[PDB]
Ligand binder design. Sequence first.
Ligand SMILES: CCCCCCCCCCCCCCCC(=O)OC[C@H]1O[C@H](O[C@@H]2[C@H](O)[C@@H](O)[C@H](O)[C@@H](O[C@H]3O[C@H](CO)[C@@H](O)[C@H](O)[C@@H]3O)[C@@H]2OP(=O)(O)OC[C@@H](COC(=O)CCCCCCCC[C@H](C)CCCCCCCC)OC(=O)CCCCCCCCCCCCCCC)[C@@H](O)[C@@H](O)[C@@H]1O
Ligand SMILES: CC(C)=CCC/C(C)=C/CC/C(C)=C/CC/C(C)=C/CC/C(C)=C\CC/C(C)=C/CC/C(C)=C/CC/C(C)=C/CC/C(C)=C/CC1=C(C)C(=O)c2ccccc2C1=O
Ligand SMILES: CC(C)=CCC/C(C)=C/CC/C(C)=C/CC/C(C)=C\CC/C(C)=C\CC/C(C)=C/CC/C(C)=C\CC/C(C)=C\CC/C(C)=C/CC1=C(C)C(=O)c2ccccc2C1=O
Ligand code: HEC
Ligand code: HEM
Ligand code: HEM
Ligand SMILES: CCCCCCCCCCCCCC(=O)O[C@H](COC(=O)CCCCCCCCCCC)COP(=O)(O)O
Ligand code: FES
Lengths: 42, 58, 184, 102, 223, 533, 51, 73, 139
Amino acid sequence: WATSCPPPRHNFTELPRIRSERPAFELHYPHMVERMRAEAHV
Amino acid sequence: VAFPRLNALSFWLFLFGALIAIAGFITPGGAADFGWTAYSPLTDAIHSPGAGGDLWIM
Amino acid sequence: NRPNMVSVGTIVWLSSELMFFAGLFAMYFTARAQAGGAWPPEPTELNLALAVPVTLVLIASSFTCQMGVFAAERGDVFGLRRWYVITFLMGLFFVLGQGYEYIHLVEHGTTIPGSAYGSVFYLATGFHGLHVIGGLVAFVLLLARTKMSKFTPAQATAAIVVSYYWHFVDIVWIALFATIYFVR
Amino acid sequence: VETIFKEPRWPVPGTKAEKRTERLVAYWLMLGGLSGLALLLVFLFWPWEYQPFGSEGEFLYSLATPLYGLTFGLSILSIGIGAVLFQKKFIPEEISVQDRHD
Amino acid sequence: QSALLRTGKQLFETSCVSCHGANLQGVPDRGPSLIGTGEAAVYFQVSTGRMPAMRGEAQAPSKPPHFDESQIDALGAYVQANGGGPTVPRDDHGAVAQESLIGGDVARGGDLFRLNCASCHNFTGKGGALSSGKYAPDLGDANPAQIYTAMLTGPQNMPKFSDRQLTPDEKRDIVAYVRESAETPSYGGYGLGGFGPAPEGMAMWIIGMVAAIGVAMWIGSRA
Amino acid sequence: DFAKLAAAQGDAIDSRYHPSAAVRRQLNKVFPTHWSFLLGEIALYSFIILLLTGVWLTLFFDPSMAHVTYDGVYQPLRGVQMSRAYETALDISFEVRGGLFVRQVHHWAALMFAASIMVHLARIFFTGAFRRPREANWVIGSLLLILAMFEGFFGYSLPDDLLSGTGIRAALSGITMGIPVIGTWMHWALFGGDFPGEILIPRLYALHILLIPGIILALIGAHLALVWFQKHTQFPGPGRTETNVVGVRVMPVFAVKSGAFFAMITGVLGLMGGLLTINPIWNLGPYKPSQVSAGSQPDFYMMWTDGLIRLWPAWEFYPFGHTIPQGVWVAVGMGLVFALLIAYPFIEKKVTGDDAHHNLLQRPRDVPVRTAIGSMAIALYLLLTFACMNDIIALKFHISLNATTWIGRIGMVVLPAIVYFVAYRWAISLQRSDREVLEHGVETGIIKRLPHGAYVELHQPLGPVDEHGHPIPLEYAGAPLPKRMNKLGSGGAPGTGSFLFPDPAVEHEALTEAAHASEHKSLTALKEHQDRI
Amino acid sequence: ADMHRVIKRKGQESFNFGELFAYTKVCSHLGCPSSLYEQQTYRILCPCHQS
Amino acid sequence: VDVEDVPSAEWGWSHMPIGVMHIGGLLSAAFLLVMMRGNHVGHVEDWFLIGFAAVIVALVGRNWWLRRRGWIR
Amino acid sequence: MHIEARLFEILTAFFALAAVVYAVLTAMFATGGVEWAGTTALVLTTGLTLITGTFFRFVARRLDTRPEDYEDAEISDGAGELGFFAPHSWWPILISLSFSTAAVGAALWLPWLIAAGVAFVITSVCGLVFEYYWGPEKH
Ligand SMILES: CCCCCCCCCCCCCCCC(=O)OC[C@H]1O[C@H](O[C@@H]2[C@H](O)[C@@H](O)[C@H](O)[C@@H](O[C@H]3O[C@H](CO)[C@@H](O)[C@H](O)[C@@H]3O)[C@@H]2OP(=O)(O)OC[C@@H](COC(=O)CCCCCCCC[C@H](C)CCCCCCCC)OC(=O)CCCCCCCCCCCCCCC)[C@@H](O)[C@@H](O)[C@@H]1O
Ligand SMILES: CC(C)=CCC/C(C)=C/CC/C(C)=C/CC/C(C)=C/CC/C(C)=C\CC/C(C)=C/CC/C(C)=C/CC/C(C)=C/CC/C(C)=C/CC1=C(C)C(=O)c2ccccc2C1=O
Ligand SMILES: CC(C)=CCC/C(C)=C/CC/C(C)=C/CC/C(C)=C\CC/C(C)=C\CC/C(C)=C/CC/C(C)=C\CC/C(C)=C\CC/C(C)=C/CC1=C(C)C(=O)c2ccccc2C1=O
Ligand code: HEC
Ligand code: HEM
Ligand code: HEM
Ligand SMILES: CCCCCCCCCCCCCC(=O)O[C@H](COC(=O)CCCCCCCCCCC)COP(=O)(O)O
Ligand code: FES
């Protein structure tokens, strides 16, 4: 979900920083990076 | 993928393998009639002599 | 560094091949348990005067195959060809040795339809013999590729993964040789 | 007709590869001669007469005609292979352009 | 021998009653009557492995035999005891005659085979295709007794050849041609299946033309 | 010694016939070196082998239909009544040393001759070699194909065996007598009476050894003379135009290549004649009208004729006390195919409207309509050929015989339509694949990850490059475009030496420098010539 | 047992001797001998063009 | 046709009129239907002919309608 | 690639325990003694993970931390050429057709068709292997 629809021949014209299991969510919503880390554990 | 050529080989190998098993219907005896679990000795030449079962195996 | 993608793929596929021989071993062991006391039954008479020298040749082929791997990693394409040609010749002798033993066994009444032991013995060893034949084809194909272009690290990788298959084939035969000719 | 390219196959003399290529062409020609000689000997001395079914000589007669084609076929084929190799390894490579005037 | 008849009925009760019934009258739309078929029909149908059948189609094909030689004789005797019929030839020892059925005049057998047998099969007896789904099988695996019984009994779609239409001497000569032509090696090399132009053309296109074209690309150039 | 003799004879010939300008103009002729241009030589070489083996067979064959009693060595046929044609045919294969080998090679040579013409016809059709000014050249070749089939058909009918006699009885008799108004008059005239008569085999023997081969040789001579004097077409490429031929001269490259190719064709035919049994007439038996066999197929080049008979439905008309059998459909359809094949270039030039001089061949992908039409014709021919073999296919492959007839019947129209659509798209699809290389270069297959995470594939430009990495797109020139980097020399050389031991390094470097220098000027010479013109 | 399924052709009703029928061996299509007579299906097959 | 549809448009015959293929399709189905007039007693083959003829007719009609409405050219 | 090898070792331990327990549980409790067809598969199932797991262990101890094996790795750390990946090839469909031809011959037991399929497979496999190594034509 971090690439265009449809993806190019090599699937990626760029790559975001991968720090968790949801790199696309982190990239599209930078303001939620802090919330996910703090609220991860109940 | 790791092996682009081998990935394409899997598709065609599967497609031609699937067609061979289905091709038992055009035979006069018919396709396989012993079930997908093909229990023994039902799948045997004595109990399954037609070519439909042979095409199913290959 | 870097993991060898071709080596990883070959090793992963080689492990799957072991499950193919698992089915063949199951047929032999299932028939062995139903022998009732005679395994192998008459008139089958296995001889170690021919199996042992042929088995030793196949074992010695692994050493020559490994010698070619060292030459391949060193960049000596000619040294790789010399050791793999010798390995091919001794690997071919295994097929001829196995085929010669098949002729005598058939003439003595041991055939695939003749006995249940003949079925488990021939399919288990014959399918391994097909693997040896397939390995010999791999040796020829790889050797033919060495004269097509310069010796590249990718070319050397193909030599290594071919030896992996040969080592797997030799190891499988040792299990088959011990199970059949010793565990009776 | 204009020959725009014409060079010898072995500009560098005294090379082991050139001698090796000379032997390779000769080996195919020698094989053709040996097979042709075999055809002469097989056609003259091999048992060719028909043998009835169940006879001792039936197997030998069954190989009479197959041996005739094996020796004759391999002889001229080997000569042709050597001739092709000589053209591709010793005859100079040339490119010629001819005006059609059609 | 009462033991042989009882043994044959004992095999019949567990193998053949499903399609032929308990009294050999035949189950309608499942199997015909076995009354009058004789021992020869049962012997051929069991030794060739054709019976017991497993399903209804164009022809039940051949398969490995379900009963051994002793059981075939018992099965044949039980059917023979009900309605009679032709019997398989036997030698002096009482076993099924195999070598004694070979005729000494193959030339007559070849002409008889061409006139009466080479229509459904081919000249060399390789087989042929019948009307719809049915097909004549290969004759290279049938022993002389099986051929004799097939001529006597006339399997599914095969005109019955009686001992009057074809005398035992003629039948013995016919199987002589069939048995001889099966094991005579081809004289011009590989037999190519012995079917005629059909394998010859396929072998030509895949061998001679492949080699000729492959040689041409070696000699010639691309682009 | 030998050098003096060479000049002695050379001056002797020149002083009498002055064959200097003529021979030099024949030893300087340039022929292109494309692999597909050797396809026609296979048919020519096969015909020569047929001439040599055919002459040998005429010294032992007695073409008679008089019944005789066999007294030869073949035990399974002792006493069997047969004609003299079948009597001597067995004598050749059994009573003559090497006769079976010659008989088998001759029959295999005929199959190569028929197959080579079909393959050679495909190249002429798909590459457009039939266009102006070679319309008559196509017509002459088309007659050769028709003559070859009938010559071969009369070939295996000579031994008078039950397999071919059945084929003669159906094809030559029933179709001929089923023709309207003048159908039984031709049959009566050709057979000299009712089937089988007593004159068919001698007449067929004469037509097969003298008349038809004589016409074929005359047509081949005109065909080869026309090709030699009207020049040979060449594929588009570097230095290739429409007013010049690019290749090698006859002496000595083409003469050696043509002579060597003849030797290897003879070896292939010689090996097959001595490794595969063909037409085992002794196993077939003499022809009797009361005897028949399953699988009575003719030879492969005549199977499509028999396949049309099997597939065509039972459509007869009975107008006012007369009868038009199902053979009229096959007879008319057979003539229609020959008429369409011969007159194709004129049809194409009338439809397309292109009536210009053509010397450069067209790639099959560049002409999708003709490629689709040819693929459609090939598919129809293959379906007709396999329909003739339906009974054996039914027996071997476990298919209902009624199914095989109806599969061919429905497939006779459905399959050609499907193949035309696929071939039309495939040919146009190939053009797009070439356009990709022109505007993007050859894909090296190497994937590189950019620092920002972009995945790109390294491309090798085929020409000049613009400001940045991307090249300027080239224009299609009708020539094949490389798509594999190994074909461009990126793979290098393994190293000079034997298969087991390496040559000295100085020798290897000298040889690789010589090879690299040779390819540098070989390509430059073509570019220099191309730029000049 | 199958005699009740026999259909007679006009002008040929009395051409049989009971259960014995005589038919020409020459196929009406092109003249091949059509002698692949199946006894149960009562189908005469011509091996040349599958009639 | 033009370059974008057939890149080698000027290098050879690349256009076939749609009328020939449409009429040929109708004749293809007509030939399938008329073949039901035969000596065969079974009707399994008759239904196969009907299905193939219907499929061909549907394809021809679909192409003609799309061409008429301007969706495809 | 420590985690990659740990996955196969975890499977190796369970497969080894199941094979040993089930063999010893059928030798004294199953009717007829050891279940052979059934045990042999379990024992060699461990070998499948053992071979892959051991090789991954040896590979991991040779190479240092990869960019994909680094908890906090940057995208630019992996910049560079990855390797060779085939752009296009029609050889795989020919190999499948060649293998299917032999299978049909094996199913119908046609010795000629089996031999043709085996020859086709070798020819098709040769093209796949040599596709990216054939040199330029020497003319
Ligand atoms: C440059 C190129 C030019 C040169 C090319 C030419 C090469 C030719 C190759 C072959 C040459 C052989 C010469 C010797 C001939 C010979 O002396 O032979 C003996 C006998 O042997 C067979 O007897 C079998 C038994 O021995 C009998 O006991 C048994 O009875 C009998 O059974 C029949 O009879 C029964 C009733 O009796 C019936 O019940 C039954 O049904 C059947 O009819 C059997 O015969 P059959 O099954 O026919 O074949 C069985 C075959 C198995 O097949 C085959 O070889 C198939 C392979 C070849 C056939 C030809 C090609 C055909 C192409 C395919 C059809 C392709 C189709 C694919 C479709 C794709 C596209 C379509 C859409 O096993 C064998 O021989 C094993 C031998 C293996 C040889 C392998 C070749 C080695 C090559 C190595 C090269 C190295 C060179 C490297 C140099 C650097 C029969 O022939 C007999 O007549 C014959 O007499
Ligand atoms: C017009 C007509 C007759 C056609 C209808 C019959 C028909 C449908 C043909 C195909 C028959 C088949 C293949 C049936 C079996 C089931 C099956 C697997 C078919 C379809 C499967 C499918 C769709 C895909 C699987 C993969 C695939 C596409 C490949 C198939 C590979 C094969 C084996 C194809 C060949 C089929 C075929 C019709 C070829 C026959 C070749 C011929 C004519 C050879 C004759 C021949 C014979 C008869 C010999 O005895 C012989 C003996 C010794 C040496 C040589 C030969 C020899 O060449
Ligand atoms: C034993 C038995 C019972 C069996 C039956 C007998 C039998 C079948 C025997 C046949 C034996 C035969 C025919 C032998 C073949 C020998 C042969 C062809 C060559 C021997 C030499 C060889 C193998 C190679 C090296 C020797 C060498 C010097 C090679 C080339 C020789 C030279 C310089 C000239 C060629 C001479 C030659 C023999 C070849 C003929 C080729 C011909 C005639 C083609 C010319 C030609 C061609 C090819 C065109 O393409 C063409 C296109 C358009 C218009 C016209 C032409 C045209 O005329
Ligand atoms: C078409 C009507 C045939 C004629 C003419 C001949 N045979 Fe036949 N044959 C035919 C069929 C349909 C079958 C199989 C029937 C079944 O139920 O499976 C057979 C079988 C044989 C066999 C058995 C071969 C075997 O099982 O291995 C033999 C030996 C045989 N036929 C011999 C034979 C002879 C000698 C013939 C001439 C008198 C003859 N057949 C003609 C079909 C037809
Ligand atoms: C016995 C039959 C035939 C023989 C001996 C034969 C032989 C040859 C030979 C040797 C050539 C020289 C160039 C080449 O090989 O491509 C040639 C060219 C040619 N042939 Fe054939 N061929 C035959 C059948 C045919 C057929 C069936 C056709 C057309 C339907 C045909 C049409 C042509 C044409 C047009 C050329 C010239 C092509 C060009 O100049 O590029 N020939 N033939
Ligand atoms: C294009 C040319 C030719 C073709 C296609 C051709 C084809 C054939 C074929 C297929 C046969 C069958 C062989 C067999 O069944 O064993 C045959 C037989 C024969 N051919 Fe030819 N042939 C050609 C030229 C010639 C020539 C030039 C001659 C004589 C000089 C000749 C003489 C014979 C004879 C005598 C036979 C019968 C011999 C026998 O069947 O044993 N043929 N021909
Ligand atoms: C029965 C005997 C058959 C003889 C066959 C021909 C053998 C002799 C070859 C003659 C070649 C002489 C070349 C030469 O250098 O001598 C030359 C003689 O003068 C000539 O050029 C005569 C030209 C006639 C040649 C054309 C005839 C056909 C030749 C075809 C060859 C394939 C000597 O030239 P020079 O003095 O060295 O400059
Ligand atoms: S000849 Fe009897 S069906 Fe055509």
